[PDB]
Amino acid sequence: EKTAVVIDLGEAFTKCGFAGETGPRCIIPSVIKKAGMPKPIKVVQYNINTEELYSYLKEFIHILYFRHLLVNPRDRRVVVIESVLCPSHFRETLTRVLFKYFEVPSVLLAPSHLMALLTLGINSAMVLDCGYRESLVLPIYEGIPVLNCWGALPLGGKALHKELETQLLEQCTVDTGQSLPSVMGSIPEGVLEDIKVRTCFVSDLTRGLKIQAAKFNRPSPPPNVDYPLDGEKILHVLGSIRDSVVEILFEQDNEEKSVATLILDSLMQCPIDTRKQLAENLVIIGGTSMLPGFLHRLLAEIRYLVEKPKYKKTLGTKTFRIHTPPAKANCVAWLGGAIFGALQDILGSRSVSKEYYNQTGRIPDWCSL
Amino acid sequence: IANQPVVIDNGSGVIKAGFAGDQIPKYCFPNYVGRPKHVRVMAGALEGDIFIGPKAEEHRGLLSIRYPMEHGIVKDWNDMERIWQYVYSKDQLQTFSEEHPVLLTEAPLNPRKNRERAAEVFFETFNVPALFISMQAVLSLYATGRTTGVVLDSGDGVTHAVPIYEGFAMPHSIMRIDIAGRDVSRFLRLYLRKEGYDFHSSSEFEIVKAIKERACYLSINPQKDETLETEKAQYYLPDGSTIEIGPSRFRAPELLFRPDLIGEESEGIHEVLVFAIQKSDMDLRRTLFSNIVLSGGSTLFKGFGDRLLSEVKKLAPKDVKIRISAPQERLYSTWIGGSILASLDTFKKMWVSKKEYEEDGARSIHRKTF
Amino acid sequence: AALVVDNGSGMCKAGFAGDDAPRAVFPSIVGRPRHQGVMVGMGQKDSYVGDEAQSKRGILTLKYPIEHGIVTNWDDMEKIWHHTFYNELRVAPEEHPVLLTEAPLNPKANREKMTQIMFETFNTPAMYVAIQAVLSLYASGRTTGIVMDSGDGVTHTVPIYEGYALPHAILRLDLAGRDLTDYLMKILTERGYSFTTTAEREIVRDIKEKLCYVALDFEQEMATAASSSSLEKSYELPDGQVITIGNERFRCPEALFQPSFLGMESCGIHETTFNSIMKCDVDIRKDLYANTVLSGGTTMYPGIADRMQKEITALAPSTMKIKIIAPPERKYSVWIGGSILASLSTFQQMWISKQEYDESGPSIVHRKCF
Numbered sequence A: 001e002k003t004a005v006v007i008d009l010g011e012a013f014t015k016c017g018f019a020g021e022t023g024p025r026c027i028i029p030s031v032i033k034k035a036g037m038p039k040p041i042k043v044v045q046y047n048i049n050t051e052e053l054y055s056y057l058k059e060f061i062h063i064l065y066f067r068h069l070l071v072n073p074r075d076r077r078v079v080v081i082e083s084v085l086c087p088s089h090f091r092e093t094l095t096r097v098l099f100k101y102f103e104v105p106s107v108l109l110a111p112s113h114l115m116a117l118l119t120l121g122i123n124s125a126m127v128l129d130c131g132y133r134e135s136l137v138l139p140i141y142e143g144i145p146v147l148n149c150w151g152a153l154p155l156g157g158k159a160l161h162k163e164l165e166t167q168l169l170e171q172c173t174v175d176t177g178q179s180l181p182s183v184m185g186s187i188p189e190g191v192l193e194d195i196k197v198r199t200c201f202v203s204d205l206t207r208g209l210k211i212q213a214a215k216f217n218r219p220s221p222p223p224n225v226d227y228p229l230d231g232e233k234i235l236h237v238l239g240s241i242r243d244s245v246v247e248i249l250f251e252q253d254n255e256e257k258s259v260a261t262l263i264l265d266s267l268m269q270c271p272i273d274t275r276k277q278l279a280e281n282l283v284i285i286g287g288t289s290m291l292p293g294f295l296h297r298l299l300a301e302i303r304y305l306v307e308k309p310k311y312k313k314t315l316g317t318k319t320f321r322i323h324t325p326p327a328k329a330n331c332v333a334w335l336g337g338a339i340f341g342a343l344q345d346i347l348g349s350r351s352v353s354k355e356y357y358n359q360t361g362r363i364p365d366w367c368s369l
Numbered sequence B: 001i002a003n004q005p006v007v008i009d010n011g012s013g014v015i016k017a018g019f020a021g022d023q024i025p026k027y028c029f030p031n032y033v034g035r036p037k038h039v040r041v042m043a044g045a046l047e048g049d050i051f052i053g054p055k056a057e058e059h060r061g062l063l064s065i066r067y068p069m070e071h072g073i074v075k076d077w078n079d080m081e082r083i084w085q086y087v088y089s090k091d092q093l094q095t096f097s098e099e100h101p102v103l104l105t106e107a108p109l110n111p112r113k114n115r116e117r118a119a120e121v122f123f124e125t126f127n128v129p130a131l132f133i134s135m136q137a138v139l140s141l142y143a144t145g146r147t148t149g150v151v152l153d154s155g156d157g158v159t160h161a162v163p164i165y166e167g168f169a170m171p172h173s174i175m176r177i178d179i180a181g182r183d184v185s186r187f188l189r190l191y192l193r194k195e196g197y198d199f200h201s202s203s204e205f206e207i208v209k210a211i212k213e214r215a216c217y218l219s220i221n222p223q224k225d226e227t228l229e230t231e232k233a234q235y236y237l238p239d240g241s242t243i244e245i246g247p248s249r250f251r252a253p254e255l256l257f258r259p260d261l262i263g264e265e266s267e268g269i270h271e272v273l274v275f276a277i278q279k280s281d282m283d284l285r286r287t288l289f290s291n292i293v294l295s296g297g298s299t300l301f302k303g304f305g306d307r308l309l310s311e312v313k314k315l316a317p318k319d320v321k322i323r324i325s326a327p328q329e330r331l332y333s334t335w336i337g338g339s340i341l342a343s344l345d346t347f348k349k350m351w352v353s354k355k356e357y358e359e360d361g362a363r364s365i366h367r368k369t370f
Numbered sequence C: 001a002a003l004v005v006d007n008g009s010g011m012c013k014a015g016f017a018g019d020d021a022p023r024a025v026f027p028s029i030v031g032r033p034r035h036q037g038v039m040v041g042m043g044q045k046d047s048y049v050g051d052e053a054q055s056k057r058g059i060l061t062l063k064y065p066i067e068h069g070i071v072t073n074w075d076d077m078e079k080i081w082h083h084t085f086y087n088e089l090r091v092a093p094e095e096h097p098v099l100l101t102e103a104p105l106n107p108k109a110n111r112e113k114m115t116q117i118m119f120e121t122f123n124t125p126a127m128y129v130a131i132q133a134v135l136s137l138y139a140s141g142r143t144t145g146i147v148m149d150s151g152d153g154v155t156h157t158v159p160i161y162e163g164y165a166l167p168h169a170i171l172r173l174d175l176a177g178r179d180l181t182d183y184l185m186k187i188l189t190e191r192g193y194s195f196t197t198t199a200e201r202e203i204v205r206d207i208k209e210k211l212c213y214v215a216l217d218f219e220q221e222m223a224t225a226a227s228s229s230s231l232e233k234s235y236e237l238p239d240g241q242v243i244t245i246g247n248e249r250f251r252c253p254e255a256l257f258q259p260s261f262l263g264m265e266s267c268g269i270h271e272t273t274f275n276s277i278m279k280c281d282v283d284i285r286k287d288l289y290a291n292t293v294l295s296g297g298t299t300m301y302p303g304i305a306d307r308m309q310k311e312i313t314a315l316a317p318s319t320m321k322i323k324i325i326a327p328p329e330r331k332y333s334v335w336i337g338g339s340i341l342a343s344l345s346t347f348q349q350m351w352i353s354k355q356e357y358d359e360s361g362p363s364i365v366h367r368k369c370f
């Protein structure tokens, strides 16, 4: 029996592979390959031209197949993993590509949070997706997502890159061969990603409080290492910015809207029965979730906001506990879609057939008719 | 002591005020408290951290807005004290709180704690000599000048039908759903994320409210607008950009008629009016269907009356005359009728003096107004 | 080898004949989930019935199929019967005769469609429909007395003297447990705890089943509850939230004795029993005042026999021996009586065979019901 190609997009890195395969075969970024392109334009973009996205998706999915899948898009099923709240135009463009240029047997625009829940095997939890563009919370109860309870914040990987760019541009101590600030008006994203993973890290809760005291009248941890850069443009990172980058990620700014506060907000809109079961089942997926100390500071921030006199009288004493998925947090949703794609029993009837799309054109989405 | 009575028409979205006899409330503004995003450490920015109305609308991208009233229930009493004080301040009335009579409005079935705390404020902080916490449906009947009628108001947080037949309010025929304008804006933002644009702030949410108030039509058949392609009427953002809204402008007001599509359990506006009439007596339904009084700001959608006529024709029995009376002053019918009621001479027995409130307290309020 | 199924408007007490306690005890509820465009995956059912819907109650919408003893949805009731037979008792209904319990003064369509379903859908060989009060009298070990049954959707009184019924002195009142649940829900909303959706109705009825008792002197108890506060007890929701209820405890079952709180314009249960006694013959009223039997789940309130005895004592003459019989097993009196009846040596001629339904049809139930 045929397999199922599980395609997962993303603004930063796309994930793809086969069905049943533990872990995807390749994780290629959302960049392109074209002549005369000094900076490869991302494939996953919104509020832009229609035909341009059609061509971008054609070439990207084409090179994705022919470079990391080694199979013709006609012999096996395709389960396109897309997170919920994705723009309808983007989904329609994906459907047009997969049914007008590749002609796959059946696509399946399955949600991300639901399959992330499928990885653990349990049927109900609270899923915090720390994606690239925005953060996303979607409570799932008995396999059904509580869609009216949602939460988004532009504090994903993009906000971390914006923070690192501005802050490193300020204390730009690029040695000669001593300061040399603003040598270049803008720095790329690859060096910024390397600074995030290899040098930046998540602080502690007490350390975060010390940073809060350091905001206005001291940064207690000072470790730093001079990050190199090609062309002998060696810069020097600071021992406090490696803390401040995560501090803006866990900042509130008198609006009570942090990454950890979003889970409590969605828990507040959830019904009374679902409360303790979502507290007893917490799942943290996403790419930003792979930072050292992120889960510890995250859980500490949750429990620190529990006794807050604004959310305590409705939540109170709860048993918060984070699950450990059998895959990496950056690629959990793909493994859920892989286990779902490896289920050839009802997927032939659950997914959208090719014949129905060619003779109908209507795409199923949570909208009337 | 006696002066001109003030009708402080509260509400979940637009707190309205003005003296009695006035046919237009000269001091209306959205009900919220403005505080800047970054916590102030010094001056040189939005000073005082307290913006309401015009000074609140002075800046949008530099404020964190906190609503004080949600679903007709006051969550932050301090914020409501500051908004009431803003009404008595140098920019809204420039009068004295301990001199003028004050009328007050409240949605039905509200908790007693709200009324008790509200009278504690209006009898301890602002020692008003006359306080009468009236309702929000009876006032619309006074504004329209009609005896019978089914008041279907729709503010920002509460939509409730109270069928009053010739001055007799039937309490067991009251249907009350906690869905209105604020939730319409929330699910409108949810649909806007499907369109492509995103909003993540309270002031940004008020920008979404402006998007809602400009273009949101209710077709009789939303599937017809779904099959066809809308022309995507643009909207010039207050920031300076433009947004092609699309189908979300009509998919969002479907909430008030089909809340089961999103995932919330309620009956809808059409079923609120229908079940409110069905809970009444058998001899009054024929007259209550022909006497429907609209109110509130959420009843200001293009094609609202037509779709409501179609849905009531679906639920009500055949050959029954229906008259959905839609006045022009729906956004101020509660305040206008409150002014008419407060201007009456029999209205003197309705309020409670300061000494009278000090006699018993909570029980004095609940006994004299009910 | 007979099956005794007690289908009320709330629980569905089912089990085998001859047994003391029934096997199946579950809330007769069906529920469809929140139909959204999103999917679920890895399987789930289409409509949860019984404890399935009771545990997964956080997202599904509770829809009772029986309203005031009237089966309002035959497909949902058919789902509950299929769940009962093939899942709670784990035995097909073709190998056994069944015994159903309907309320008195029940519209004939229910009594006939019930038989049509039990024969055409399940292919049962014999089915009998008995009045719940008669079975309560069987389980009470008496052949003389009046049964004041009170379910969640119906409440009736049936006087039976020396095994003979009085079909004209049978009263019926729709003021039962579900109306009490709605009243408690409204007053809990009045104290500041909004229990809006149907999923919250199970929590408010749990509050009713745990902390609600019948006050002896309602005015004295209400005055002391407004005076003191020791009567105010606490309770925990499924969440970590904790509430406190002061009046609600004793003011919740007060509607049973005072229907004016719900606008029913009727008589309380005590005077309903009194009128049901007065409609009998003057020579057999002593036995009815002595053998007054309470049954059903709505009579499980702590301290209710004292209220019934005091009210009837005030109504009945001074030379009468007012005696209230309230067994601790009155929550299953209908089922126990069904067990006794089904296991009798005489009842075999009282069935309705399959060929009898094949010949006559649905009209044989009225000539064979009672």
Ligand SMILES: Nc1ncnc2c1ncn2[C@@H]1O[C@H](COP(=O)(O)OP(=O)(O)OP(=O)(O)O)[C@@H](O)[C@H]1O
Binding pocket: C006, C007, C008, C009, C010, C011, C012, C101, C132, C150, C151, C152, C153, C177, C178, C205, C208, C209, C210, C212, C296, C297, C298, C299, C300, C301, C302, C331, C334
């Ligand atoms: N301890 C209790 N105190 C007060 N009310 C209770 C208690 N236990 C159960 N109830 C109420 O009694 C009702 C139970 O209904 P019941 O057991 O009478 O079944 P039913 O479906 O009404 O059928 P039937 O009337 O034939 O038994 C429920 O509405 C419940 O709220």
Ligand SMILES: Nc1ncnc2c1ncn2[C@@H]1O[C@H](COP(=O)(O)OP(=O)(O)O)[C@@H](O)[C@H]1O
Binding pocket: A009, A010, A011, A012, A013, A014, A130, A131, A132, A133, A157, A158, A193, A196, A197, A286, A287, A288, A289, A290, A291, A330
């Ligand atoms: N090994 C890693 N350690 C820490 N952060 C990582 C790691 N790998 C990726 N990331 C972060 O994850 C983000 C990618 O998230 P992604 O899954 O692409 O979001 P989306 O849900 O939009 O696809 C990047 O911005 C990067 O900063």
Ligand SMILES: Nc1ncnc2c1ncn2[C@@H]1O[C@H](COP(=O)(O)OP(=O)(O)O)[C@@H](O)[C@H]1O
Binding pocket: B010, B011, B012, B013, B014, B015, B016, B154, B155, B156, B157, B181, B182, B209, B212, B213, B214, B216, B295, B296, B297, B298, B300, B301, B331
């Ligand atoms: N023209 C309009 N179009 C769409 N929505 C409106 C319009 N006018 C008002 N609204 C909505 O109705 C609300 C105002 O209703 P109102 O009766 O003033 O509420 P309240 O009684 O709580 O003050 C606003 O919050 C707004 O969301």
